[PDB]
Amino acid sequence: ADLEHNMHTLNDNLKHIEKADNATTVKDALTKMQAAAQDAWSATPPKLEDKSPDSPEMSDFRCGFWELIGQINAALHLAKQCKVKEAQAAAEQLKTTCNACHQKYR
Amino acid sequence: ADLEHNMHTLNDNLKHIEKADNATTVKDALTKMQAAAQDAWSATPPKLEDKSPDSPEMSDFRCGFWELIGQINAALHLAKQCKVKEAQAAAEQLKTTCNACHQKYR
Amino acid sequence: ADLEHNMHTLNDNLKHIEKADNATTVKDALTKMQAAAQDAWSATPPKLEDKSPDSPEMSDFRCGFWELIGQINAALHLAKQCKVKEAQAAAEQLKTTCNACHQKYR
Amino acid sequence: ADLEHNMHTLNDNLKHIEKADNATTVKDALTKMQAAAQDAWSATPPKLEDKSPDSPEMSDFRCGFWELIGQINAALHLAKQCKVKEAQAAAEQLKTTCNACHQKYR
Amino acid sequence: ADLEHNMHTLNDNLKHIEKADNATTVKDALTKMQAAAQDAWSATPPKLEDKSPDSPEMSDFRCGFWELIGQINAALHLAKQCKVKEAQAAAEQLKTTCNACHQKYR
Amino acid sequence: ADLEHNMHTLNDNLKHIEKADNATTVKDALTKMQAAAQDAWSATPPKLEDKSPDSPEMSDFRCGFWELIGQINAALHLAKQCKVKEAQAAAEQLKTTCNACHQKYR
Amino acid sequence: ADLEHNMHTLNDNLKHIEKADNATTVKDALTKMQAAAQDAWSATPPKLEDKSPDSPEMSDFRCGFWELIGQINAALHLAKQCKVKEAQAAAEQLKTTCNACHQKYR
Amino acid sequence: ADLEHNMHTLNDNLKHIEKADNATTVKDALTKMQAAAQDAWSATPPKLEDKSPDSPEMSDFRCGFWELIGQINAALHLAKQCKVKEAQAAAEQLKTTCNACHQKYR
Amino acid sequence: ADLEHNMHTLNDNLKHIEKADNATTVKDALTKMQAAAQDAWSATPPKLEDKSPDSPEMSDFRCGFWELIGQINAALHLAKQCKVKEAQAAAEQLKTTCNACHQKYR
Amino acid sequence: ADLEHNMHTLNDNLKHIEKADNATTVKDALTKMQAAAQDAWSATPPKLEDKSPDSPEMSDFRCGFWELIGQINAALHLAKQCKVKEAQAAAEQLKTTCNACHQKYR
Amino acid sequence: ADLEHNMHTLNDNLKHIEKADNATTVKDALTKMQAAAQDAWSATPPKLEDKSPDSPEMSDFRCGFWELIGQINAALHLAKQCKVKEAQAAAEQLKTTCNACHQKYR
Amino acid sequence: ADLEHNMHTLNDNLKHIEKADNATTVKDALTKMQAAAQDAWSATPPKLEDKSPDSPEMSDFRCGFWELIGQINAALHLAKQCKVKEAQAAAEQLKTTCNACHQKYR
Ligand code: HEC
Ligand code: HEC
Ligand code: HEC
Ligand code: HEC
Ligand code: HEC
Ligand code: HEC
Ligand code: HEC
Ligand code: HEC
Ligand code: HEC
Ligand code: HEC
Ligand code: HEC
Ligand code: HEC
Ligand SMILES: [Fe+3]
Ligand SMILES: [Fe+3]
Ligand SMILES: [Fe+3]
Ligand SMILES: [Fe+3]
Ligand SMILES: [Fe+3]
Ligand SMILES: [Fe+3]
Ligand SMILES: [Fe+3]
Ligand SMILES: [Fe+3]
Ligand SMILES: [Zn+2]
Ligand SMILES: [Zn+2]
Ligand SMILES: [Zn+2]
Ligand SMILES: [Zn+2]
Ligand SMILES: [Zn+2]
Ligand SMILES: [Zn+2]
Ligand SMILES: [Zn+2]
Ligand SMILES: [Zn+2]
Ligand SMILES: [Zn+2]
Ligand SMILES: [Zn+2]
Ligand SMILES: [Zn+2]
Ligand SMILES: [Zn+2]
Ligand SMILES: [Zn+2]
Ligand SMILES: [Zn+2]
Ligand SMILES: [Zn+2]
Ligand SMILES: [Zn+2]
Ligand SMILES: [Zn+2]
Ligand SMILES: [Zn+2]
Ligand SMILES: [Zn+2]
Ligand SMILES: [Zn+2]
Ligand SMILES: [Zn+2]
């Protein structure tokens, strides 16, 4: 998938996690987010099209997806423990990472 | 698995590699360690729970696991060539990476 | 596979990409390169055999493969969209990453 | 997935189909829509929650998804023949089926 | 399986759902029912053996199973959300569909 | 596959069923017919190209494939019971459905 | 799955074996009995709910199911040898093993 | 895998079951114990290395592990029934079987 | 498969193990013996064809094969530990178990 | 499948290749032909039923399928490169091999 | 497997086919022979060890196995049609091919 | 793959086999050669583009790949026996076949 739709997947599923009332819906939504974040790591955003592949901005862009992937995996562990409110709280914390990347590069 | 048990897997299997005679036992122990390290990369240790996900400490934490994961993979290559003594020597070298992370974050 | 043969896979398939006239062969070549680069990330090059695994040199070496893996995945996305000339141009741009590592560490 | 998110999948992927320039992305989008429509056939919409399951309203609701599923499969056949503009035109014609159900039951 | 035994599976597992405490047992019982209903859709009951395949009775027969299959799927969705009481209530509603078909064709 | 070749598959295999003298050849031929009928359900015949997707003719066209798929499944059950003459008789009865659709729409 | 329903599977499939007129229904019924018996082997019967898990009663219960499993497989063997009537006689013989455990723990 | 490490897996996972607060960690721990016990069943203990493989000692050792396997599965059954505290009590009960074999062969 | 030929597989592979000069042929031969013994366990020997399936004779026959299976696995264990000569000695030891059952039922 | 139906598969799919306007359908048709020709290599034609299996006639018959299989694989390579007209021309050249065998042995 | 044991498999299973009553036993025996013949095709017999790989003897050797492999496949077709006597007659015909090769190269 | 790259695969891997010091590297390299040789059998070399598909040159070309595939399979058997020097010697002998085809057709 392209970067735009990977963002649709992250956003759409993150909103279902907030609305959910059970661990299974949360785990399923987080699984879809994990695959979108894994795919997105390799993209180049439009604001960075002219930078070199080794620029600090592109290293910083990749670091943001590393952070996001790790936090999604940690939320998945909580959902697998049937700790639904804890997983939802971890999914909310994820938005700090979404926000930080958007501020600089979206 | 949670971080504690990933550390059980790392520590337990590293001891077997040191005492192993044949490459089949080193190979399976390394394979178990590889999976534990790939899982632990995504964790947040207790002492860093309140740091930001992009903090230099959490970045350094994840660097530790990249170094560990790469070193286990290199040791696994030697084990698949049936180079037991070389694989055990690569395993022994890993400990510097274990110790360095513990000193800072355990 | 060992580092040397991963470089064989990269070199051989990149030559085929330059000469291709259809998206299918570009895709197949890029997929092989992706797997070769994934594997090579964990290697330690000769010129670096006596540096520490956490050294700035080994960290930079892994950075080069991250950049390479990302660019290959982006080229693969172009090829899967049947944009043969554009994937070829992305493949040609890989050489800046190949040369930069080689100058430092080959 | 629930009815609401199946509609998300339909809406999101249909927008990507309109904007696509290659058969590959059209195919991938249609496949996701096919799975969403398959799943939604078994749902009961809000406006129909108090009708009998054998009611002419619920029978008509399922008829709409049968028609939708068939049209998506036909569009997918066009996309698999690499007829991008023709699959896009078949996708655009889906909207008559979307609107007709929505007018009655959304 | 023949139609008789599909009916065994439907009747037996519906009784378990009514008495079940946990969602795992409701989920597996519904899964068994779903497979039995999907199989029974293709059958011809004894009393309709000499009707034409397009007869209004055989069409009505297959409509009964479409209604049943959809209702089981909706109940299975609730069970996968761990909503035991709601799933059991959806299961209980199924019986109208069982009874309506039996009255006409058993 | 397209509608024409799905018809080749139905016709070719139905003739082998008549010639067969064992259950295995019959079951294999019926399995191929089932997949062709499943695929064909989504097509639009040339005589109906101008009708709307919800027209009664297109509903009637889909009903014919429903009937055919159900009868193929029933024949498959007999072949699986090693009831070869019974399965062949059921395959002959299938031609009433082929005929009825051809009369109106071929 | 729950012990009571595994018993249902054993009882019902024995009825079908007794009525069957072909090897493949007998084989399919014996296969389902075999799965049900292997799942039942891990259950605790209501009347042994307070014995300890290493009690002679729980070891004897599990042994009882292990012997049933061996006899089911031996009957399945005969059916694969195409000895339908011998397989049916063997299945009928199971009832002595069923009753033996029932006298003790049902 | 080597007998000593299978023992490690049994011991460590028992510690995690005792501390667990949710069914799924208990289930995951019991599943790993089950695999470790089935692999240990094929080992020869150091103190029986010179007995013959059909000796009463080796048959009793293998029987001992077969009984542990049955008790592990029975505990896993309870956990799948969502009886977390009962599954934990059952796991605690295993220690009598562990100690029984240890007295003889450890 | 038929009991007599499973015996062929046991006998022939024992001859190959005795002649082998490498672990992997020994492992491959022991694996085939293990499969043959597990398939033979479900057979009825000609001389027990009229005993009842719960007779002591049929339980003892099945028990006999269960013990052979355990000893084959224990030999396979040694071979995976790269103890080729010990695995060959263990395989040679099987003949006492072969002869024991033969005296009774061959 | 028998020889006759393999020839059906060859004939039917070769007609579709001639009429195709996209690489996808050519590829699918060639793949079916490949499997048909693979299967037919082992057949004995009627006109040769009384020759010896090592006869120059049967050897020549197999040579014809080797030549046919090779040409189909070469056509498939062209189709996988999206060279539709070139694969069609390779398919048309197959007919020299079809006719040459038919003249001798059909 | 080495050539000797492939010959064990051929000879052993051919004897079972001659004495078999049902098609299931002929079918599995033929399947075993087919795999043994496909493997033996690649071997070099002792008496030809010093001939060139393109020698007329090694070519004739491989022709023998092509004839054998084709004949086994034809016999397997008859067995899959449940034509036991015809399959056994095709198997018996194979022996000319066995004998012809042995006379020259055993 | 095309014939040129299949030759790269044969050549590249054959050189690694000579350098190897363990059976695993040799077996892995031989596995890649086997797949390349299987693919190459269907090609037409440039020097033979004008010959007919049944010409003696094209039969001779296919014979060369037959010989190569058989010898690769024999080398694989030795590598699987952990006979590393023997497998390497067999891989060297393979070059006679490479040479003979190149002399005539490259
Ligand atoms: C960088 C490391 C990012 C992270 C982490 C996340 N997003 Fe993002 N997002 C990023 C960019 C560069 C862009 C612009 C993409 C473009 O091609 O223009 C976006 C865009 C979005 C959007 C808008 C998509 C659209 O409809 O055009 C959304 C809704 C979005 N992003 C959501 C989102 C969420 C929820 C994230 C965390 C879970 C997240 N993004 C992370 C870069 C990055
Ligand atoms: C950071 C990058 C680490 C690396 C690399 C390794 N370990 Fe570790 N370990 C780390 C932390 C933060 C912790 C604390 C976990 C907690 O929740 O408190 C640990 C813990 C351990 C333990 C103790 C586990 C326990 O029972 O509490 C052990 C035995 C252990 N670690 C071993 C170990 C080994 C052998 C490593 C390299 C092979 C290794 N660790 C790497 C952080 C990190
Ligand atoms: C570091 C991040 C590298 C990147 C990116 C690429 N290569 Fe590389 N390459 C690297 C090293 C350290 C070495 C030396 C390995 C050794 O054993 O000394 C190489 C070597 C090569 C070779 C020579 C292989 C041989 O036969 O000896 C080639 C042909 C090669 N590299 C090609 C290549 C290409 C095409 C790359 C980009 C697509 C590329 N390399 C990236 C380190 C790194
Ligand atoms: C009946 C046969 C329908 C067909 C065909 C399509 N849709 Fe639908 N849609 C339907 C209902 C009953 C509803 C209401 C669901 C509810 O929970 O109230 C909807 C809703 C939507 C939405 C809104 C989703 C949301 O976020 O609330 C969208 C965006 C939507 N539908 C899009 C859509 C498209 C693109 C369709 C064709 C491709 C389509 N729908 C078909 C019923 C039916
Ligand atoms: C038509 C659309 C049906 C639906 C929906 C259900 N059943 Fe049914 N059932 C149907 C027929 C035509 C028959 C007769 C079968 C025969 O060959 O005579 C049955 C039979 C049963 C039985 C009796 C089975 C037996 O042992 O003979 C039972 C117990 C049964 N059906 C239960 C059942 C349940 C619980 C259903 C809904 C969940 C249900 N049936 C639906 C036709 C149809
Ligand atoms: C509608 C519900 C149909 C059913 C059921 C069957 N067929 Fe059909 N068939 C149908 C159409 C609309 C057409 C014309 C297709 C076109 O694109 O022109 C056909 C065509 C055939 C053909 C001719 C194919 C050709 O070579 O052009 C055959 C041989 C055929 N159909 C056979 C057939 C059989 C054997 C069926 C029952 C098993 C059957 N069809 C069902 C519509 C429908
Ligand atoms: C012990 C080793 C048993 C063997 C062998 C068989 N059964 Fe059983 N059965 C057993 C128990 C402990 C129970 C009680 C289950 C409970 O939850 O109370 C049963 C019960 C049954 C039932 C009744 C189920 C119900 O609806 O209440 C039936 C119909 C039954 N068992 C049948 C059955 C058959 C046919 C068996 C052999 C083929 C058989 N059982 C074996 C214990 C054991
Ligand atoms: C026989 C049937 C056994 C059962 C049941 C259990 N164990 Fe065991 N254990 C057994 C032996 C022969 C040995 C000696 C292994 C050796 O290589 O010397 C052991 C050893 C242990 C150990 C110590 C391992 C070590 O590090 O030296 C532990 C911690 C252990 N066993 C635990 C254990 C548990 C928790 C069990 C039940 C859950 C259990 N064992 C069962 C033989 C047998
Ligand atoms: C009982 C538990 C047995 C064990 C353990 C082994 N064998 Fe057996 N064997 C058994 C029976 C009942 C029979 C008679 C089979 C028949 O159909 O008549 C046999 C037979 C053999 C044969 C002869 C087969 C033949 O061609 O007639 C052989 C060569 C043989 N058995 C070998 C064998 C070996 C090597 C075993 C251990 C490794 C072994 N058997 C175990 C019963 C049992
Ligand atoms: C020998 C090497 C053959 C090659 C290459 C092809 N065919 Fe063939 N074909 C062959 C024989 C011996 C027969 C007779 C089979 C019989 O049972 O008598 C045939 C038959 C056909 C048929 C008629 C099938 C029927 O319905 O009776 C057709 C339509 C046919 N062959 C087509 C065909 C095509 C298109 C081929 C190349 C692509 C082809 N054959 C190759 C022997 C051989
Ligand atoms: C050449 C093309 C052969 C064909 C066809 C068959 N066999 Fe063979 N066989 C062949 C050789 C070169 C050898 C000698 C193997 C050695 O290393 O010495 C054999 C050997 C046998 C044996 C003896 C095996 C042993 O225990 O030493 C048997 C029992 C045997 N062959 C049987 C056999 C059968 C039944 C065949 C057709 C179905 C058959 N062989 C074909 C060469 C060839
Ligand atoms: C015919 C039966 C061949 C066999 C066996 C082998 N090769 Fe080959 N090779 C062959 C041809 C016709 C060609 C020319 C291909 C072309 O399209 O021009 C080749 C070419 C090579 C090359 C050069 C590839 C290149 O870079 O252009 C190499 C390195 C090569 N062949 C190696 C090789 C090896 C190592 C073989 C045995 C293991 C081998 N070939 C077999 C024809 C045939
Ligand atoms: Fe960094
Ligand atoms: Fe739960
Ligand atoms: Fe209708
Ligand atoms: Fe049969
Ligand atoms: Fe016992
Ligand atoms: Fe394409
Ligand atoms: Fe030849
Ligand atoms: Fe080894
Ligand atoms: Zn993507
Ligand atoms: Zn999107
Ligand atoms: Zn984990
Ligand atoms: Zn642990
Ligand atoms: Zn590697
Ligand atoms: Zn290489
Ligand atoms: Zn859903
Ligand atoms: Zn959604
Ligand atoms: Zn059925
Ligand atoms: Zn039943
Ligand atoms: Zn289709
Ligand atoms: Zn066709
Ligand atoms: Zn039940
Ligand atoms: Zn351990
Ligand atoms: Zn045999
Ligand atoms: Zn066939
Ligand atoms: Zn046909
Ligand atoms: Zn072999
Ligand atoms: Zn042998
Ligand atoms: Zn190829
Ligand atoms: Zn190449």
From Swiss-Prot, chains A, B, C, D, E, F, G, H, I, J, K, L:
Binding residue positions for heme b: M7, H102
GO molecular function: electron transfer activity; heme binding; iron ion binding
Keywords: Electron transport, Heme, Iron, Metal-binding, Periplasm, Signal, Transport
GO biological process, one term: electron transport chain
GO cellular component: periplasmic space
Subcellular localization(s) per the UniProt record: Periplasm
Cofactor note: Binds 1 heme b (iron(II)-protoporphyrin IX) group per molecule.
Region (Disordered): 38-60
Keyword Repeat among UniProt keywords: no
TM spans (from-to): none
Biased composition (Basic and acidic residues): 47-60
Cofactor: heme b
Domain of life: Bacteria
UniProt family annotation: Belongs to the cytochrome b562 family.
Subunit structure: Monomer.
Role of this protein: Electron-transport protein of unknown function.
Protein name: Soluble cytochrome b562
Species the sequence originates in: Escherichia coli
Encoding gene per record: cybC
Shown segment, full-protein numbering: 23 to 128 of 128
